[PDB]
Amino acid sequence: TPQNITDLCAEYHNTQIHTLNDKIFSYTESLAGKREMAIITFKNGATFQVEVPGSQHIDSQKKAIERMKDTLRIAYLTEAKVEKLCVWNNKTPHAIAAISMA
Amino acid sequence: TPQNITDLCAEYHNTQIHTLNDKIFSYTESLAGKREMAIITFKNGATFQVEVPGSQHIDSQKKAIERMKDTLRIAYLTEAKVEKLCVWNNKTPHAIAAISMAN
Amino acid sequence: TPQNITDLCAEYHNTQIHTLNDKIFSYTESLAGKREMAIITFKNGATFQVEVPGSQHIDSQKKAIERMKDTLRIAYLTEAKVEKLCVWNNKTPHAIAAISMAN
Amino acid sequence: TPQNITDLCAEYHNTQIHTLNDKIFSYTESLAGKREMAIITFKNGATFQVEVPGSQHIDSQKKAIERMKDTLRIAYLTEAKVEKLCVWNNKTPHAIAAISMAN
Amino acid sequence: TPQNITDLCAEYHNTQIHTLNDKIFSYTESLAGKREMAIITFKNGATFQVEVPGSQHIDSQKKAIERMKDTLRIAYLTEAKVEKLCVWNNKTPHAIAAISMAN
Amino acid sequence: NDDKLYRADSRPPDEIKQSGGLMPRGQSEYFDRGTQMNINLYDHARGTQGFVRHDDGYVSTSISLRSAHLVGQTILSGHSTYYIYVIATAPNMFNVNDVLGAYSPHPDEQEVSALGGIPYSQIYGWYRVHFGVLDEQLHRNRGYRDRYYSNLDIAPAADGYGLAGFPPEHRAWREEPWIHHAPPGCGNAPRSNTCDEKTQSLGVKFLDEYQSKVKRQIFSGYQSDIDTHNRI
Numbered sequence: 001t002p003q004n005i006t007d008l009c010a011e012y013h014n015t016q017i018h019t020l021n022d023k024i025f026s027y028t029e030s031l032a033g034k035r036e037m038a039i040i041t042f043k044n045g046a047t048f049q050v051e052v053p054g055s056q057h058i059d060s061q062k063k064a065i066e067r068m069k070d071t072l073r074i075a076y077l078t079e080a081k082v083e084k085l086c087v088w089n090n091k092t093p094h095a096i097a098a099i100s101m102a
Numbered sequence: 103t104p105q106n107i108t109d110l111c112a113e114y115h116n117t118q119i120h121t122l123n124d125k126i127f128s129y130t131e132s133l134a135g136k137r138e139m140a141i142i143t144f145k146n147g148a149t150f151q152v153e154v155p156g157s158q159h160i161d162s163q164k165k166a167i168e169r170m171k172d173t174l175r176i177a178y179l180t181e182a183k184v185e186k187l188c189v190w191n192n193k194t195p196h197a198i199a200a201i202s203m204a205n
Numbered sequence: 206t207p208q209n210i211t212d213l214c215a216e217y218h219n220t221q222i223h224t225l226n227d228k229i230f231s232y233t234e235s236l237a238g239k240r241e242m243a244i245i246t247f248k249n250g251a252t253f254q255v256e257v258p259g260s261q262h263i264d265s266q267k268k269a270i271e272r273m274k275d276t277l278r279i280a281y282l283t284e285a286k287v288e289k290l291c292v293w294n295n296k297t298p299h300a301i302a303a304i305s306m307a308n
Numbered sequence: 309t310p311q312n313i314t315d316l317c318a319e320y321h322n323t324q325i326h327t328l329n330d331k332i333f334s335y336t337e338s339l340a341g342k343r344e345m346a347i348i349t350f351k352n353g354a355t356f357q358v359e360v361p362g363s364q365h366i367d368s369q370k371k372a373i374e375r376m377k378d379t380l381r382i383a384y385l386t387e388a389k390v391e392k393l394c395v396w397n398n399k400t401p402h403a404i405a406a407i408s409m410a411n
Numbered sequence: 412t413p414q415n416i417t418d419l420c421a422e423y424h425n426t427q428i429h430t431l432n433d434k435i436f437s438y439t440e441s442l443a444g445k446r447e448m449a450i451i452t453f454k455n456g457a458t459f460q461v462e463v464p465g466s467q468h469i470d471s472q473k474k475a476i477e478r479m480k481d482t483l484r485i486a487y488l489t490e491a492k493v494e495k496l497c498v499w500n501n502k503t504p505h506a507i508a509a510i511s512m513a514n
Numbered sequence: 515n516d517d518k519l520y521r522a523d524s525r526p527p528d529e530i531k532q533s534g535g536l537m538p539r540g541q542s543e544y545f546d547r548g549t550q551m552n553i554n555l556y557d558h559a560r561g562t563q564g565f566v567r568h569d570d571g572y573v574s575t576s577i578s579l580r581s582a583h584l585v586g587q588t589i590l591s592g593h594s595t596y597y598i599y600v601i602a603t604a605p606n607m608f609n610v611n612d613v614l615g616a617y618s619p620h621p622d623e624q625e626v627s628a629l630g631g632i633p634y635s636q637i638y639g640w641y642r643v644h645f646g647v648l649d650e651q652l653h654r655n656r657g658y659r660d661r662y663y664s665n666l667d668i669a670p671a672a673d674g675y676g677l678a679g680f681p682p683e684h685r686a687w688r689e690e691p692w693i694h695h696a697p698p699g700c701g702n703a704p705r706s707n708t709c710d711e712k713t714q715s716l717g718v719k720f721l722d723e724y725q726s727k728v729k730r731q732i733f734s735g736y737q738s739d740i741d742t743h744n745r746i
């Protein structure tokens with residue numbers, strides 16, 4: 001219904017677009033209790049998370065959180081250029097809401 | 103049962119075939135609440151979505167919607183040429199019902 | 206237990222082997238209601254489906270139907286040579302029961 | 309707990325290690341009823357199955373059986389050299405319990 | 412929330428960071444009952460496991476254990492450099508809690 | 515290391531992608547080994563240049579952009595548009611002067627040649643050349659893998675001496691270093707078609723082995739999306 005990631009971001013409070021136009025520099029993944037998450041960085045040091053699933057997520061988001069972590073791993077290993085990230089900026093690191101690749 | 107995407111598309115109301123014969127230019131995916139969707143774009147501007155699962159979908163479609171986003175993602179990443187898309191032309195962006203890939 | 210696809214095929218009455226020794230020419234996938242299926246073709250025109258899950262399938266086949274759709278997509282994208290298909294031929298397109306890959 | 313495939317295999321009766329150091333020659337998978345299984349071969353004729361899930365398996369193995377079939381498909385398509393297979397030798401074909409890949 | 416693997420590791424007892432800056436030398440995977448696990452080695456002989464899931468893992472970890480086995484299998488095949496592993500050292504071999512890949 | 519090689523070629527990027535790379539003459543796809551072309555470095559290096567050398571199962575490159583441009587201007591004059599492909603080093607690449615030694619036919623050219631062609635993933639990108647003028651903008655190839663190829667180099671000459679492809683009666687096979695690497699039927703071997711058949715089969719085996727490494731890298735990345743638990 002939004003046609004692109006910028007319009008999607010504008011539908012939510014506490015978000016912003018980061019324009020990276022760069023491949024992921026590092027990919028980190030944890031299975032440790034209460035920290036079942038992924039973190040990625042870019043060569044400029046920008047750091048981002050896919051949050052641990054929690055009470056801030058509705059049920060429909062659970063499959064999507066898993067899909068995002070799958071997308072970040074393949075994007076890292078194929079050196080895919082990421083165009084933009086939409087994130088919640090009230091989290092540290094900023095938490096990924098959406099990704100675009102072009 | 104249909105032999106191809108064009109015959110499949112014709113079994114449905116409010117559908118049409120788009121013919122791209124091109125790789126996907128952009129792939130966008132979202133996990134935001136109520137916007138768990140994907141959007142693709144072609145270099146000519148054509149934009150399509152995989153709809154957020156909802157009341158318009160029967161249960162047997164849920165796994166297929168998940169598969170389609172997986173397919174679009176890997177098609178994008180591998181630069182696979184997409185032949186045709188069957189889409190519902192009563193959504194904006196037009197909603198994908200089926201994809202065919204071929205060179 | 207069968208040791209190859211020809212022998213496995215022979216355990217069912219309504220199946221046959223097709224020998225392709227060729228990569229998949231097109232891969233088509235649908236999420237449309239009642240047609241949640243995949244279709245493949247080869248350059249000679251031979252066309253095959255992975256059927257929509259139905260009353261003909263036992264519970265153990267459900268996961269395997271999904272695996273077969275995974276298999277065909279990645280076989281398509283990697284241009285892997287398909288040796289043989291075992292199919293049910295009381296359906297059109299012929300419905301895939303098994304696949305063998307070899308160069 | 310074991311630190312390698314040979315030690316892991318040794319924990320079970322009716323097992324043995326095959327040292328192959330070779331890529332998979334052929335990959336076969338089936339969604340036919342009661343034969344939901346994978347079969348691989350090597351160029352020297354050696355043939356191995358991943359068993360149909362059944363009462364010889366405990367519930368925790370079910371997820372690993374599915375993972376193993378994916379591992380074998382991936383290995384086949386990538387022409388990855390398989391180092392060793394741990395198998396049960398009281399089945400024909402010998403049934404895979406574990407796989408190692410090195411380099 | 413931690414911003415990197417070193418800070419994540421510091422949150423846990425009986426945990427250690429190994430700095431490898433190397434690709435995985437071997438990947439082993441098992442579906443044998445009570446040994447549904449993965450083992451990796453590095454060329455210097457360092458050996459690590461993904462543990463068999465059990466009651467030392469909370470429910471939320473179950474999915475993540477499966478993800479880590481997916482990640483290790485494919486990191487091995489793509490020869491991806493692993494930067495660091497966060498591991499529990501109250502197990503032999505040390506058990507993986509987290510992985511970072513860079514360079 | 516991250517060293518690059520360069521090749522002028524009239525074939526455009528879309529065709530390169532469909533072909534799986536920059537292919538030798540007669541070959542329409544990299545991995546599709548249905549019809550097996552002649553692989554012979556000596557024959558390849560001696561081939562005549564309206565194409566930059568690409569016959570007999572190898573594709574030639576230069577060691578700098580300027581060198582490849584100058585060659586492009588010599589050989590591809592009268593293509594209003596051509597491309598200069600920027601190519602990573604990897605062990606499918608042979609330094610022709612090193613492998614053929616004093617029998618390298620065009621040693622001033624300093625050519626490096628890829629056995630079986632240059633797979634798409636080994637292509638960093640490309641410049642467009644319009645009426646001989648290099649466009650300033652390098653177009654980057656999405657199929658490229660930098661960490662992979664920047665950790666690899668060209669083949670050492672010792673891996674190529676045995677593939678040099680000299681005729682059985684050529685004196686190279688009786689001289690160092692090639693005498694230590696001569697295929698069966700070549701040189702001082704009794705009654706030196708065996709030599710050429712063995713050059714061919716050795717080349718096919720080299721390419722089979724090399725192709726397994728490309729498949730492993732590229733097709734493993736293509737399968738790094740799988741999430742087991744979601745299906746389990």
Ligand SMILES: OC[C@H]1O[C@@H](O)[C@H](O)[C@@H](O)[C@H]1O
Nearest residue numbers: 219261262293295296300341
């Ligand atoms: O198990 C799948 C098969 O089931 C049979 O009953 C049916 O006749 C076949 O067409 C095929 O669908």
Ligand code: NA
Nearest residue numbers: 515603663666
């Ligand atoms: Na290199």
